[PDB]
Design a protein around this nucleic acid. Sequence first.
RNA 1: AUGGCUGUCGUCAGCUCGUGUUGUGAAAUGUUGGGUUAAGUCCCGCAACGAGCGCAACCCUUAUCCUUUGUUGCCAGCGGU
Length: 106
Amino acid sequence: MLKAGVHFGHQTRYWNPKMKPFIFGARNKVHIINLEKTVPMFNEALAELNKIASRKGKILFVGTKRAASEAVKDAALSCDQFFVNHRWLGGMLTNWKTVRQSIKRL
RNA sequence: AUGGCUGUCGUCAGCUCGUGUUGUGAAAUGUUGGGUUAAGUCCCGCAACGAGCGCAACCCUUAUCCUUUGUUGCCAGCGGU
C-alpha cells in the first residue's frame, strides 16, 4: 500500500542475516525491505494493540532517536498513552520498585 | 602483648551499600569513558537507578554596612580651659 515516498528499505548493504525472508537489495548495494510483506504484518499487529486497547491497556511508545524524539512524544501526547522519547532507562521496568519513587521526587 | 593519644600518606579523591541486570565467584556493572573547584563535586554517554561516608556546605576566632547596657570611654556642632 505504497501511499508515501520513502519507506522501502535501508541502512546499508551489511545487515542482520536473521531477517533474510523480508528483504531485497538497492542500488547503493543497500538492502530494500518488502512492504508487500509488511502490509499483512501490521494488519495482524494493529488489531492486537486494539485488543488490549479494547481491554483499555497501557501502551508505551519508546525511542530516544534524537531526530524523531519529539514526534513520538507528539504521538503519545496525542491520545492518552505514555512514552519514553529520551534515553530509555536501563532498569525502569525491572526496577519499577525504585524508579517508581523517581517519580516520587518529581 | 596493648588501649588512649599521636605523625599516618595528604586535604590527597577517593571508599561501600540497597535494588535491577550480565556471569560461577575470589563477580562486575554502577564508581567507567568524553569534558570538569583546587574534586566519583557537577553535565553527557552508559544496564543501571538511587543512597551513605570523605568532597562541598553548615563553624567564626575572619575583612565590614546597621541597634541593645557609657564604671575602671570616645569627639562632629557650642561653653570653661
